Amino acid sequence: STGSATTTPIDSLDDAYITPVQIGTPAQTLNLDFDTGSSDLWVFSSETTASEVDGQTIYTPSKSTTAKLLSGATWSISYGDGSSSSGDVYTDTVSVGGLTVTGQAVESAKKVSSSFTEDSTIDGLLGLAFSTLNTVSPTQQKTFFDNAKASLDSPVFTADLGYHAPGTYNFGFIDTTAYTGSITYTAVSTKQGFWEWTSTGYAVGSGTFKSTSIDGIADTGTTLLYLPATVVSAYWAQVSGAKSSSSVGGYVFPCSATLPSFTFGVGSARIVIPGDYIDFGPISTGSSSCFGGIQSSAGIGINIFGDVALKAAFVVFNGATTPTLGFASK
Ligand SMILES: NCc1ccc(C(F)(F)F)cc1
Ligand SMILES: NCc1ccc(C(F)(F)F)cc1
Numbered sequence: 630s631t632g633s634a635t636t637t638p639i640d641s642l643d644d645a646y647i648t649p650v651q652i653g654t655p656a657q658t659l660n661l662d663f664d665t666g667s668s669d670l671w672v673f674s675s676e677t678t679a680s681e682v683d684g685q686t687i688y689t690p691s692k693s694t695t696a697k698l699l700s701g702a703t704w705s706i707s708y709g710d711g712s713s714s715s716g717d718v719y720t721d722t723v724s725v726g727g728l729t730v731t732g733q734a735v736e737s738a739k740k741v742s743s744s745f746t747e748d749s750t751i752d753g754l755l756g757l758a759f760s761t762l763n764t765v766s767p768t769q770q771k772t773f774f775d776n777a778k779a780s781l782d783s784p785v786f787t788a789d790l791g792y793h794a795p796g797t798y799n800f801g802f803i804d805t806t807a808y809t810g811s812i813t814y815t816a817v818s819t820k821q822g823f824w825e826w827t828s829t830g831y832a833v834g835s836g837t838f839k840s841t842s843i844d845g846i847a848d849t850g851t852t853l854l855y856l857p858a859t860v861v862s863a864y865w866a867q868v869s870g871a872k873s874s875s876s877v878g879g880y881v882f883p884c885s886a887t888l889p890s891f892t893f894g895v896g897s898a899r900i901v902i903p904g905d906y907i908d909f910g911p912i913s914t915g916s917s918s919c920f921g922g923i924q925s926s927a928g929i930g931i932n933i934f935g936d937v938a939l940k941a942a943f944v945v946f947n948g949a950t951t952p953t954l955g956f957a958s959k
Contacts, residue, residue, distance in 0.1 A: 630780050631801035632728025636663065636790065639750040642909055643936060644852050646790060647751060648798055651724040652735060653693030659686050659752035663798055664850030665788070665824050665946065666933075668762035668772050669706050670723070671714055671736035672753035673745075681741050684749035690737065696721045704736045704764045709851075709929060714741040718765055723773060725755075728800050730777050734763075734770035754850070757786070757946070762822035774800070774948060784948040788849055789959070790940035792906060808943035808957035813898035817952045823848070824946060826954050828934075829896060831856075833864050834889030838899070845932030847939060847946070847954055853909070854891075854902075855926040855933040864891060864923050871921070877912050880921040884911060891923060893938065895956040902941040 636648040647660035652672070659672055673685040690696040696719045705715035716739035723733040738753070745751065756763070760771045778784045781801035789807055790796040797807070818825045828843040843856065861880065865871040867889050871882040882888070888904030907922035922937045945955030 630728055630777075631782055631799070632724075632726040632777075633797060633799045634726030635795050636798050637795045638791065638793065639748070641793070643790075643793060643940065645748075645751060646796070646849070646936070648725070648755070650755060652688055653690070653721050654695040655693075656724070657686075657688055657693065659688060660750065661753045661755040662751050662850060663757060663788075664754045664848070665757040666846060666848035666850040667706065667708065667754060668756040668758045668760055668822065669704060669736055669764055670734065670753070670755050670773055671704065671706070671716070671738055673741070674716070674737040674739075676716060677738045678740055681746045683746050686752045688735065688737065688753075690719045690721070690735075693721055695731075696735075699734065699765075699768075702765050702768060702770075704766065706764045710744070712742045712744045714738045714745060716740065718770070725773065725800065726798070728777060728781075730773055733773055733776055734765060736765065757849070758824060759819050759822045761819075774946075777801075778948055786946050786948070788939060788944045788946065790849070790936060792903075792940055796940070803945060808959045810958050811898075812943070812945060812955040812957040813895045814945070814947070814953045814955045815896055817954050819952060821846075824952075824954060829894030831860055831894065832892040832899075833867050834904075836867075838892065838894070839863075840894070843893070843932055845926075845934050847934050847944065849936060849939060851933045851935030852937070853933075853935050854907075854923045854937040855929055855931075855935065856923060857932065858925045858927045861923055861925045864889070865921065873925075874918075877918075877920070879924040881912060881918045882921055884917050884919040886919075893934075898956065900938070900942050900956055900958065902938060906937055906941060
């Protein structure tokens with residue numbers, strides 16, 4: 630079987646992408662943030678503290694004839710940005726773009742951090758990292774992808790994120806009309822539970838490509854591109870007036886500047902991020918200082934190929950017994 634669903638940016642900056650997901654019987658449709666950096670499927674629900682819900686669509690397990698409470702199971706997650714949520718666990722039927730999994734663990738939020746409450750357009754997250762990171766206790770639960778794997782035509786999913794435009798998540802098949810040229814595959818390490826791989830280097834604008842190994846994770850759930858301080862300094866040095874701002878929390882640049890492109894290596898292939906993808910607009914309404922889309926990973930501890938990088942490519946998440954990542958231009 631296969632599944633295919635359109636994913637849509639939540640705002641004019643592509644801060645995140647939401648994809649409709651059908652949960653329960655009859656279907657309750659929620660718009661979830663597909664996150665290859667985490668492994669919990671959790672949703673705003675009728676159990677969420679009422680003051681912490683502000684416009685989100687909620688899952689109501691009592692209205693689903695297929696929902697079953699998972700006795701004694703709880704979950705609690707903390708994301709790298711400081712966000713968190715926690716609650717209890719149901720199993721229910723979950724469908725993505727025609728692809729149905731029965732008995733999927735659906736984690737019902739009882740408490741969420743302020744960043745989720747203020748994001749009225751995100752009804753929850755759908756984790757797509759490896760199931761070793763799932764936070765359900767005492768019995769760890771499997772991801773939607775892991776549950777669907779056996780029935781998929783091919784054990785893969787692909788991310789085709791749009792720049793200021795809709796895109797597509799496909800499960801079980803590779804759309805050969807969605808990319809140009811060839812797909813270049815690269816080795817994945819699962820030892821930390823992430824889609825972790827090694828980029829072969831980088832270039833800034835039309836500059837010389839620097840061959841250097843950059844270990845990082847492919848994370849649809851993170852907005853920006855987080856790279857080592859040396860790389861990020863070399864990029865912003867080509868932008869007149871750009872500087873690192875402690876008060877703002879990263880590199881900013883005069884909004885009137887034109888940004889250079891950024892190239893990253895995938896084996897012998899090259900993915901080019903257009904400079905416009907790196908502009909994240911004024912730091913505050915009316916400001917002439919703009920926030921950069923490439924930032925240092927030094928405080929994070931791991932490099933993150935987030936949406937800024939992934940939306941420049943067609944990305945194959947190959948969940949074969951030896952998993953690999955594929956990148957193609959588009
Ligand atoms: N998108 C989920 C996520 C959040 C944080 C991290 C970090 F920062 F710990 F690497 C990775 C993945
Ligand atoms: N990386 C996972 C993640 C995704 C979205 C959010 C936000 F923006 F909704 F708070 C936080 C963390």
